[PDB]
Every structure is written in structure tokens, then in C-alpha cells.
Amino acid sequence: EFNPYARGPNPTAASLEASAGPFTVRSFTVSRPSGYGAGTVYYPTNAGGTVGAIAIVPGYTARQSSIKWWGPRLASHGFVVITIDTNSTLDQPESRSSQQMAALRQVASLNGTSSSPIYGKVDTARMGVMGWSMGGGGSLISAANNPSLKAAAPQAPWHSSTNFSSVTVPTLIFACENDSIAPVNSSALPIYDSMSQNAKQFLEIKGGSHSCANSGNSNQALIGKKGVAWMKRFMDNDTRYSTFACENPNSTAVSDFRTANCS
Ligand SMILES: *[C@@H]1O[C@H](CO)[C@@H](O)[C@H](O)[C@H]1NC(C)=O
Ligand SMILES: *[C@@H]1O[C@H](CO)[C@@H](O)[C@H](O)[C@H]1NC(C)=O
Ligand SMILES: *[C@@H]1O[C@H](CO)[C@@H](O)[C@H](O)[C@H]1NC(C)=O
Ligand SMILES: *[C@@H]1O[C@H](CO)[C@@H](O)[C@H](O)[C@H]1NC(C)=O
């Protein structure tokens, strides 16, 4: 069927590995954050139609800088992306999930706000969640509590419980092989293995420390391709991205790859 959510040119490995997607990106600081500490909104100026919204949360002690690279990278492919700072840098996963969802709520509110740069740019029914470490755990809590979310793609996630068997949202877990903060064997892989009801994927970056998917990482072509492909496939229902979303990269930079129920 004609997909009313399809945006942008037909993807290629090259187009998805590039630093920038097809759309021009602008950004603004949120003047009065509603339910979180601070936020930057990244948006395409020329997507050609309304686009989904993604909210991204940092890890413990961390700020927008740790996750900022996702803002332009995703927005340039046709998303409105909010990177947040938490109320406290020492907020835990449940609080991070609440704040992530408050950020999505504010982006949806701004779609209806005539003074906003994202006035009329958002499809409030199509949302995604991403984040690092405790903000990754928070993303999985967000998905568990809000199953109408269309996609989740946390990185090096941690939560006090690894049991996300209730999650029905398509979930891509970025993991870091040599993580010594939230070891893969005790955190990311148990989380991945808990999820039985969803499309899901596990992508472990070989030799990576806990920060392996953060701003300034040396694998932006692969990690950015996978994140954009997952969000395109599931937030936009865009089957042009089915092979990019589901494929094993068969990459010497990937130490572990798993996927299930992917189409
Ligand atoms: C974040 O702080 C705002 C402002 O005080 C508040 O409305 C919100 O409830 C806080 N969120 C959490 C999860 O503590
Ligand atoms: C966002 O606003 C635009 C223009 O007013 C509108 O066409 C669109 O439906 C809105 N989004 C949602 C999800 O209602
Ligand atoms: C996770 O929680 C579900 C729901 O209680 C339970 O049936 C299951 O045993 C737990 N799963 C794991 C993977 O420990
Ligand atoms: C991985 O290899 C399989 C089997 O040869 C192939 O179907 C798939 O395209 C490969 N992935 C990439 C990125 O080429």
C-alpha cells in the first residue's frame, strides 16, 4: 500500500552511513521545559510531511553532550528529535522514563503552538525512545508503560531489573563489548533475552567501553545507519528499510549480533 509516512529518497548503505541525511536540520533550546531539566529540539526544515518524534536521555552524571550526535543524524532523515537534560544528573531509570515521556509530550504540544519552529511538523501518533545507560533503561521502561510507542533504540542500557518481557515495541539494543559499568552479560544481553513479544535486535560494538555509542564515537556510520534504519522501519512503517533494519551487518566492528521477529 501507499505509505503516508514514507519520507525522503530511497535509502542506500551509502546514504545511511553518511554523516547527514537528505533533510536540512535546525534546532532550538526549549524555553520552559515541562517535566524535565532542559532540552534541545532538532527538526528537518524540508521533510515534505509531518514526521515522528524521538526523545533521547543521557546516562547517570551525563548531559545532552553525550547523546547530542543523534539529534542532527536522526532529524536529517525525517524526525523531530529532543535531547534532554534530566532534572538531576543523578536521576534513576524510572525518573528518566517519566522525563523522556514529558519531553515527547512537550514536542507534541509544540506541534500545536503557532510560535514554535516545529508547528505542524510532528505526527504526535508516531514516537520513539532512545537513551544511554540509565536513560537506556528509562527508554525500555517508557516502552513497557507506553506500548503505542513505535520504536525503542537504547544504548548500553541499565535498569535495576533486566526483565522487559512485557515490551511489545520494536527494540534495538546497542551494546558495548567491553562495558565495565553495565556489563553486557549482566545488563544489555539479559535485557535483550527477556523480550519475547517484539521485533528486536542486539548490536554489540567490538572493544567498546560504556560510551561506545555516544557523541564522538568512531562507529557513527554503522551505529547511525542502524539507528536511522530501525526508526524509519518502525516509526514510519517504512519497509524500504526492512533489510537495513533486520540485516546482520556481517561487520568486523560488531562482536555480537542477534535479531528476532524482524521484518
Ligand atoms: C522534573 O522536574 C519537574 C519540575 O520540578 C517536575 O514537574 C517533574 O515531576 C520532575 N520529574 C521527575 C520524574 O521527578
Ligand atoms: C500537527 O499540526 C499540523 C498542522 O496544524 C497538523 O496538520 C497535524 O495533524 C498535527 N499533528 C497531529 C499528530 O495531530
Ligand atoms: C519476567 O517477568 C515475567 C512476568 O512475570 C515472568 O514470567 C518471567 O519469568 C520473567 N522472566 C525472566 C526472563 O526472568
Ligand atoms: C550478511 O550476510 C548475509 C548472507 O550472505 C546477507 O544476506 C546479508 O546481506 C549480509 N549483510 C550485509 C550488510 O551485507
Tab-separated table of C-alpha atoms and ligand atoms in Angstrom:
chain	number	residue	atom	x	y	z
A	1	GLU	CA	0.000	0.000	0.000
A	2	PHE	CA	0.979	3.703	-0.388
A	3	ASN	CA	2.690	4.630	2.909
A	4	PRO	CA	1.571	8.103	4.074
A	5	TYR	CA	4.574	8.155	6.490
A	6	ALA	CA	7.287	7.457	3.911
A	7	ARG	CA	9.670	10.407	3.645
A	8	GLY	CA	12.871	11.048	1.701
A	9	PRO	CA	14.694	9.288	-1.104
A	10	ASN	CA	15.019	5.514	-1.329
A	11	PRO	CA	17.782	4.553	1.092
A	12	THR	CA	21.215	3.106	0.246
A	13	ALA	CA	24.015	1.843	2.508
A	14	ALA	CA	25.944	4.983	1.479
A	15	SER	CA	23.027	7.361	2.224
A	16	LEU	CA	22.504	5.814	5.682
A	17	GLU	CA	26.281	5.671	6.567
A	18	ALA	CA	26.737	9.360	5.655
A	19	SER	CA	27.165	11.971	8.443
A	20	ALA	CA	23.962	13.671	7.203
A	21	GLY	CA	20.666	12.515	5.723
A	22	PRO	CA	18.716	14.250	2.978
A	23	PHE	CA	16.928	16.958	5.034
A	24	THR	CA	18.233	20.278	6.313
A	25	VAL	CA	18.277	20.469	10.140
A	26	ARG	CA	17.671	23.373	12.501
A	27	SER	CA	17.477	23.325	16.298
A	28	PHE	CA	16.201	25.343	19.267
A	29	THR	CA	16.549	25.266	23.081
A	30	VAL	CA	13.242	24.581	24.901
A	31	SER	CA	12.351	27.851	26.761
A	32	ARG	CA	10.339	26.260	29.593
A	33	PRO	CA	10.890	22.517	29.886
A	34	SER	CA	7.738	20.777	31.103
A	35	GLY	CA	8.676	17.861	33.393
A	36	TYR	CA	12.429	17.605	32.687
A	37	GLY	CA	15.540	19.691	33.106
A	38	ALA	CA	16.399	21.114	29.675
A	39	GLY	CA	16.014	20.190	26.028
A	40	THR	CA	17.259	20.784	22.501
A	41	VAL	CA	14.845	20.094	19.609
A	42	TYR	CA	16.329	19.131	16.224
A	43	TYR	CA	13.983	19.181	13.264
A	44	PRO	CA	14.020	18.921	9.470
A	45	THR	CA	13.059	22.120	7.653
A	46	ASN	CA	12.064	20.361	4.386
A	47	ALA	CA	10.825	16.811	5.183
A	48	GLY	CA	7.763	17.300	2.966
A	49	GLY	CA	5.228	15.930	5.505
A	50	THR	CA	4.749	15.512	9.253
A	51	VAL	CA	7.351	13.268	10.946
A	52	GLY	CA	7.571	11.213	14.146
A	53	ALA	CA	9.233	12.421	17.370
A	54	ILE	CA	12.082	10.802	19.274
A	55	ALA	CA	13.190	11.669	22.831
A	56	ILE	CA	16.756	10.830	23.917
A	57	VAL	CA	18.013	10.715	27.510
A	58	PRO	CA	21.605	10.684	28.799
A	59	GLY	CA	23.220	8.378	31.339
A	60	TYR	CA	23.942	8.876	35.037
A	61	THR	CA	26.019	12.110	35.646
A	62	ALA	CA	25.725	12.880	31.921
A	63	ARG	CA	24.205	15.659	29.866
A	64	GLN	CA	22.901	16.280	26.324
A	65	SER	CA	26.513	16.329	25.017
A	66	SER	CA	26.790	12.504	25.484
A	67	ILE	CA	23.827	11.849	23.116
A	68	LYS	CA	23.689	15.068	21.010
A	69	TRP	CA	25.120	13.490	17.812
A	70	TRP	CA	21.816	11.578	17.372
A	71	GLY	CA	19.864	14.864	17.099
A	72	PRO	CA	21.133	16.038	13.704
A	73	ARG	CA	21.758	12.467	12.492
A	74	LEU	CA	18.127	11.372	13.029
A	75	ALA	CA	16.477	14.735	12.231
A	76	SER	CA	18.285	14.858	8.853
A	77	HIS	CA	16.438	11.618	7.885
A	78	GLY	CA	12.996	12.993	8.877
A	79	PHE	CA	12.340	13.039	12.623
A	80	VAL	CA	11.835	15.677	15.302
A	81	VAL	CA	14.420	14.761	17.971
A	82	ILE	CA	14.551	16.150	21.535
A	83	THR	CA	17.754	15.571	23.562
A	84	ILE	CA	17.180	16.235	27.259
A	85	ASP	CA	18.988	17.005	30.442
A	86	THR	CA	17.317	15.413	33.465
A	87	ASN	CA	16.066	17.304	36.486
A	88	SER	CA	19.180	15.928	38.263
A	89	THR	CA	22.201	14.299	36.676
A	90	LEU	CA	21.707	11.624	39.368
A	91	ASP	CA	18.123	10.664	38.443
A	92	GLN	CA	17.444	6.930	38.213
A	93	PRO	CA	15.767	4.974	35.341
A	94	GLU	CA	12.109	5.347	36.423
A	95	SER	CA	12.544	9.141	36.750
A	96	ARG	CA	14.403	9.223	33.392
A	97	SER	CA	11.466	7.388	31.769
A	98	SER	CA	8.942	9.892	33.194
A	99	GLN	CA	11.102	12.803	31.974
A	100	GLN	CA	11.550	11.187	28.496
A	101	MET	CA	7.782	10.888	28.151
A	102	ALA	CA	7.366	14.505	29.385
A	103	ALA	CA	9.756	15.576	26.614
A	104	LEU	CA	7.685	13.698	23.998
A	105	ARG	CA	4.563	15.339	25.458
A	106	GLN	CA	6.156	18.809	25.094
A	107	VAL	CA	7.220	18.110	21.493
A	108	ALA	CA	3.652	17.046	20.711
A	109	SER	CA	2.405	20.269	22.470
A	110	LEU	CA	4.722	22.397	20.321
A	111	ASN	CA	3.212	20.878	17.112
A	112	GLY	CA	0.070	22.843	18.097
A	113	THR	CA	1.953	26.043	19.163
A	114	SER	CA	1.929	28.579	16.297
A	115	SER	CA	5.147	30.325	17.598
A	116	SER	CA	7.176	27.070	17.593
A	117	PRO	CA	9.678	26.159	14.826
A	118	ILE	CA	8.061	22.646	14.851
A	119	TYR	CA	4.485	23.973	14.497
A	120	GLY	CA	2.693	21.440	12.211
A	121	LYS	CA	5.891	19.345	11.720
A	122	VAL	CA	5.059	16.451	14.097
A	123	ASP	CA	2.810	13.420	13.804
A	124	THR	CA	2.040	13.067	17.507
A	125	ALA	CA	0.837	9.447	16.994
A	126	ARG	CA	4.357	8.193	15.967
A	127	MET	CA	7.033	8.353	18.681
A	128	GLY	CA	10.295	6.701	19.626
A	129	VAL	CA	12.590	6.481	22.643
A	130	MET	CA	16.400	6.316	22.868
A	131	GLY	CA	18.991	6.911	25.573
A	132	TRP	CA	22.257	5.878	27.182
A	133	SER	CA	22.780	3.702	30.282
A	134	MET	CA	20.078	4.618	32.848
A	135	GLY	CA	18.493	6.656	30.035
A	136	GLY	CA	18.521	3.422	28.018
A	137	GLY	CA	16.823	1.592	30.897
A	138	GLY	CA	14.420	4.518	31.033
A	139	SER	CA	13.702	4.045	27.314
A	140	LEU	CA	12.757	0.391	27.953
A	141	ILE	CA	10.536	1.445	30.929
A	142	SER	CA	8.932	4.030	28.586
A	143	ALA	CA	8.232	1.294	26.007
A	144	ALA	CA	6.879	-1.130	28.651
A	145	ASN	CA	4.494	1.525	30.030
A	146	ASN	CA	3.521	3.057	26.639
A	147	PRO	CA	3.139	0.240	24.102
A	148	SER	CA	1.838	2.646	21.420
A	149	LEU	CA	5.463	3.900	21.084
A	150	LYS	CA	6.605	2.749	17.674
A	151	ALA	CA	10.299	2.034	18.365
A	152	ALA	CA	12.970	1.981	21.057
A	153	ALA	CA	16.766	2.032	20.458
A	154	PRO	CA	18.639	2.349	23.791
A	155	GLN	CA	22.431	2.161	24.045
A	156	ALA	CA	24.409	0.347	26.788
A	157	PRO	CA	21.172	0.168	28.799
A	158	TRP	CA	20.967	-0.438	32.550
A	159	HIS	CA	17.973	-0.968	34.863
A	160	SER	CA	17.638	-2.494	38.345
A	161	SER	CA	15.517	-5.223	36.658
A	162	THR	CA	16.566	-6.823	33.319
A	163	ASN	CA	13.047	-8.285	32.836
A	164	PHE	CA	11.429	-6.433	29.911
A	165	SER	CA	9.256	-9.409	28.809
A	166	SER	CA	6.173	-7.056	28.693
A	167	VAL	CA	7.704	-4.923	25.890
A	168	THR	CA	5.856	-5.249	22.576
A	169	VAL	CA	7.579	-2.204	20.977
A	170	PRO	CA	10.263	-2.951	18.316
A	171	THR	CA	13.530	-2.596	20.251
A	172	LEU	CA	17.135	-2.309	19.013
A	173	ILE	CA	19.733	-2.615	21.825
A	174	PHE	CA	23.143	-1.117	21.124
A	175	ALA	CA	25.703	-2.766	23.422
A	176	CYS	CA	29.394	-2.181	24.084
A	177	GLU	CA	31.524	-5.378	24.212
A	178	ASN	CA	33.916	-4.282	26.998
A	179	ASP	CA	31.387	-2.307	29.028
A	180	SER	CA	32.570	-2.394	32.647
A	181	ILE	CA	29.766	-0.079	34.010
A	182	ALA	CA	26.786	-2.157	32.826
A	183	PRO	CA	28.475	-5.356	31.585
A	184	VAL	CA	26.740	-6.900	28.587
A	185	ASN	CA	26.430	-10.257	30.402
A	186	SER	CA	24.571	-8.721	33.379
A	187	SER	CA	22.677	-5.884	31.640
A	188	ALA	CA	22.213	-5.450	27.837
A	189	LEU	CA	22.090	-9.189	26.913
A	190	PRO	CA	19.728	-10.273	29.775
A	191	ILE	CA	17.502	-7.287	28.792
A	192	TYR	CA	17.568	-8.423	25.124
A	193	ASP	CA	16.917	-12.102	26.063
A	194	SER	CA	13.900	-11.091	28.260
A	195	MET	CA	11.932	-9.664	25.307
A	196	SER	CA	9.817	-12.440	23.697
A	197	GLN	CA	6.876	-10.483	22.159
A	198	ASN	CA	8.588	-7.973	19.877
A	199	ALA	CA	10.717	-7.302	16.853
A	200	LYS	CA	14.125	-6.897	18.478
A	201	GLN	CA	17.820	-6.621	17.684
A	202	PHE	CA	21.121	-6.682	19.592
A	203	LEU	CA	24.207	-4.973	18.136
A	204	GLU	CA	27.403	-5.158	20.210
A	205	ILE	CA	30.289	-2.866	19.179
A	206	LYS	CA	33.587	-4.816	19.382
A	207	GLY	CA	36.009	-3.475	22.049
A	208	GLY	CA	33.542	-0.782	23.078
A	209	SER	CA	33.548	0.898	26.512
A	210	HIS	CA	30.262	2.011	28.154
A	211	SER	CA	30.381	5.223	25.980
A	212	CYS	CA	30.731	3.342	22.629
A	213	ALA	CA	27.523	4.817	21.026
A	214	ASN	CA	27.959	8.349	22.459
A	215	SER	CA	28.886	11.607	20.712
A	216	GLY	CA	32.430	11.329	19.414
A	217	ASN	CA	32.293	7.559	18.806
A	218	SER	CA	34.336	6.192	15.854
A	219	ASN	CA	31.497	3.969	14.528
A	220	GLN	CA	28.943	6.674	13.546
A	221	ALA	CA	28.498	5.249	10.012
A	222	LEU	CA	27.353	1.794	11.301
A	223	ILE	CA	25.609	2.956	14.507
A	224	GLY	CA	23.857	5.850	12.708
A	225	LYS	CA	22.807	3.607	9.825
A	226	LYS	CA	21.271	1.073	12.232
A	227	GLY	CA	19.530	3.666	14.433
A	228	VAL	CA	18.033	5.531	11.477
A	229	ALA	CA	17.072	2.259	9.729
A	230	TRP	CA	15.320	0.936	12.887
A	231	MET	CA	13.436	4.193	13.455
A	232	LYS	CA	12.483	4.517	9.775
A	233	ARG	CA	11.288	0.922	9.563
A	234	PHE	CA	9.206	1.028	12.744
A	235	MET	CA	8.210	4.686	13.341
A	236	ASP	CA	7.323	5.192	9.653
A	237	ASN	CA	6.255	1.574	8.906
A	238	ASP	CA	8.714	2.059	6.024
A	239	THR	CA	9.503	-1.338	4.504
A	240	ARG	CA	12.096	0.294	2.203
A	241	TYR	CA	14.207	-0.026	5.392
A	242	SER	CA	13.289	-3.674	6.225
A	243	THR	CA	16.644	-5.117	5.035
A	244	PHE	CA	18.716	-2.307	6.618
A	245	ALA	CA	16.729	-2.700	9.872
A	246	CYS	CA	16.891	-6.516	10.078
A	247	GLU	CA	20.230	-7.429	8.421
A	248	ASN	CA	23.354	-8.620	10.171
A	249	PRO	CA	25.962	-6.008	9.153
A	250	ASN	CA	28.392	-9.021	8.982
A	251	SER	CA	30.952	-6.481	10.315
A	252	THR	CA	34.410	-6.924	11.884
A	253	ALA	CA	33.382	-3.906	14.096
A	254	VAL	CA	30.440	-5.938	15.542
A	255	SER	CA	31.344	-8.529	18.217
A	256	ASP	CA	27.724	-9.803	18.658
A	257	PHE	CA	24.586	-9.570	16.561
A	258	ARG	CA	21.188	-11.064	17.318
A	259	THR	CA	17.746	-10.337	15.900
A	260	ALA	CA	14.258	-11.855	16.248
A	261	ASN	CA	10.799	-11.276	14.714
A	262	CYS	CA	12.290	-8.663	12.346
A	263	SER	CA	10.501	-7.842	9.049
B	1	LIG	C1	11.163	17.014	36.894
B	1	LIG	O1	11.100	18.314	37.488
B	1	LIG	C2	9.845	18.932	37.076
B	1	LIG	C3	9.928	20.355	37.655
B	1	LIG	O2	10.039	20.338	39.063
B	1	LIG	C4	8.675	18.165	37.638
B	1	LIG	O3	7.447	18.713	37.093
B	1	LIG	C5	8.788	16.712	37.274
B	1	LIG	O4	7.820	15.998	38.025
B	1	LIG	C6	10.148	16.187	37.635
B	1	LIG	N1	10.164	14.785	37.196
B	1	LIG	C7	10.520	13.761	37.956
B	1	LIG	C8	10.315	12.456	37.258
B	1	LIG	O5	10.897	13.854	39.134
B	2	LIG	C1	0.496	18.800	13.782
B	2	LIG	O1	-0.045	20.040	13.216
B	2	LIG	C2	-0.303	20.019	11.784
B	2	LIG	C3	-0.631	21.404	11.198
B	2	LIG	O2	-1.526	22.030	12.111
B	2	LIG	C4	-1.452	19.067	11.623
B	2	LIG	O3	-1.730	19.013	10.217
B	2	LIG	C5	-1.024	17.711	12.172
B	2	LIG	O4	-2.059	16.730	12.135
B	2	LIG	C6	-0.632	17.818	13.640
B	2	LIG	N1	-0.238	16.515	14.175
B	2	LIG	C7	-1.036	15.746	14.830
B	2	LIG	C8	-0.397	14.472	15.166
B	2	LIG	O5	-2.267	15.944	15.104
B	3	LIG	C1	9.953	-11.818	33.620
B	3	LIG	O1	8.705	-11.475	34.120
B	3	LIG	C2	7.724	-12.402	33.589
B	3	LIG	C3	6.429	-11.801	34.031
B	3	LIG	O2	6.402	-12.023	35.438
B	3	LIG	C4	7.980	-13.812	34.161
B	3	LIG	O3	7.032	-14.795	33.681
B	3	LIG	C5	9.324	-14.263	33.656
B	3	LIG	O4	9.829	-15.455	34.271
B	3	LIG	C6	10.394	-13.227	33.977
B	3	LIG	N1	11.397	-13.543	33.001
B	3	LIG	C7	12.667	-13.754	33.187
B	3	LIG	C8	13.339	-13.735	31.843
B	3	LIG	O5	13.219	-13.883	34.276
B	4	LIG	C1	25.128	-10.657	5.750
B	4	LIG	O1	25.282	-11.867	5.047
B	4	LIG	C2	24.059	-12.427	4.590
B	4	LIG	C3	24.365	-13.779	3.934
B	4	LIG	O2	25.424	-13.684	2.958
B	4	LIG	C4	23.430	-11.457	3.612
B	4	LIG	O3	22.142	-11.989	3.234
B	4	LIG	C5	23.360	-10.026	4.199
B	4	LIG	O4	23.136	-9.095	3.134
B	4	LIG	C6	24.695	-9.576	4.756
B	4	LIG	N1	24.681	-8.193	5.324
B	4	LIG	C7	25.191	-7.131	4.648
B	4	LIG	C8	25.188	-5.751	5.298
B	4	LIG	O5	25.651	-7.237	3.501
